[PDB]
Ligand binder design. Structure first.
Ligand code: TYZ
Ligand code: TYZ
Ligand code: TYZ
Ligand code: TYZ
Ligand code: TYZ
Lengths: 32, 32, 32
């Protein structure tokens, strides 16, 4: 169960890093 | 401890999935 | 290993909370 969790958490880290980059780009595209 | 972590990870997966879908839709609306 | 996963999951939770705030703003500006 911990080895499986480690792999799910690594997959989440890679998806969140990306979303952060895509959201940063969208924020620039949309503007203020 | 591991059961509680499994619950937290499943909740994060459900939030990341969605964010991915919302981001995809926003990308289309910006012209990518 | 368990403490290391708890650290990583906490970090992810605070990055996903945010992404949800910034995606909520983008969706409001583009949608309305
Ligand atoms: C949990 O991810 C976990 C628990 C047990 C094992 N392996 C064996 C042989 O029991 C892998 C992973
Ligand atoms: C951690 O989430 C954890 C550790 C032990 C137990 N024990 C039992 C018997 O349920 C639950 C959860
Ligand atoms: C889409 O945004 C999407 C589709 C399915 C799920 N599933 C669950 C269980 O939340 C999340 C998000
Ligand atoms: C897991 O994150 C983990 C496991 C063991 C230890 N330290 C000792 C002394 O057992 C730290 C962290
Ligand atoms: C986001 O949910 C968030 C982040 C920081 C703060 N800070 C204060 C002091 O209210 C509120 C909400």
């Amino acid at each position: 169960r911990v080895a499986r969790l480690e792999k799910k958490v690594s997959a989440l880290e890679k998806k969140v890093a990306x979303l952060e980059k895509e959201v940063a780009r969208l924020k620039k595209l949309v503007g203020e």
